[PDB]
A paper describes a structure:
Within this class of proteins, the bromodomain and extraterminal domain (BET) family contains four members that are transcriptional coregulators and that recognize acetyllysines (AcKs) using a tandem pair of highly homologous bromodomains (BDs). Using the highly conserved BET BDs as a model system, we conducted three mRNA display-based RaPID (random nonstandard peptides integrated discovery) screens using a single library (which contains >1012 unique members).
Likewise, the most abundant family identified in the BRD3-BD2 selection (BRD3-BD2 family 3, accounting for 53% of total sequencing reads recovered for the top 500 peptides, including 3.2C) was not found in the BRD3-BD1 screen. On the other hand, the family to which 3.2B belongs was identified in the BRD3-BD1 screen with a relatively high abundance (BRD3-BD2 family 2, accounting for 8% of total sequencing reads recovered for the top 500 peptides from the BRD3-BD2 selection and 19% from the BRD3-BD1 selection; SI Appendix, Figs. S9B and S10). Cyclic peptide 3.2B showed strong binding but relatively little specificity, consistent with the abundance of related peptides found in the BRD3-BD1 selection; interactions with each of the six BDs had affinities in the range of ∼10 to 30 nM. Strikingly, 3.2B forms a single, well-defined α-helix in both structures; this helix contacts the AcK-binding surface of the two BDs with a very similar overall geometry and places its single AcK (AcK7) into the canonical binding pocket. It is notable that the AcK side chain enters the pocket at a similar diagonal angle to that observed for AcK5 in the peptide 3.1B binding to the “second” copy of BRD4-BD1. Because of this insertion angle, the hydrogen bond made by 3.2B with the pocket Asn is again mediated by a water molecule. Most of these hydrophobic contacts are conserved between the BRD2-BD1 and BRD4-BD2 structures, consistent with the similar affinities observed for the two interactions. Furthermore, peptides that belong to the same family but were derived from different selections (3.2B and 4.2A) adopted near-identical structures and binding modes.
Author numbering:
A (entry chain C): 1 to 12
B (entry chain A): 63 to 190
Amino acid sequence: WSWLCKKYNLIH
Amino acid sequence: GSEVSNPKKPGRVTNQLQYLHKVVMKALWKHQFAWPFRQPVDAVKLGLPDYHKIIKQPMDMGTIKRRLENNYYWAASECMQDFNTMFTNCYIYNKPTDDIVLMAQTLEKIFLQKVASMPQEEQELVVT
Ligand SMILES: [N]
């Protein structure tokens, strides 16, 4: 939901 | 973290640096695809134990934006190098098929198109 959550799912 | 201000480093405003700040950066910062690049990559929070071994110079749009605001650069070529470093870091660490690589490639294409309309002769600006 958050920036960190989406950044994580994107970079992995 | 990369420095955004240094009194010992020559810096100034030029017509090209002003264009990158008020035209190019203003458009790229608000772009939909910019969200992964607006702040530094946090290897601890993201679980990237080898990021800082592969990436020798981390770079993000927030650092570039602050360098433009602080007159950190001497020439527009320095700002272009930081953008190139930000995009190439993503190309190096991630696989060519990853979605984030295509996001960086698309942002890079916008960046280069906007730079094509930059003033071609660089001239220092001192009037405030
Ligand atoms: N990913």
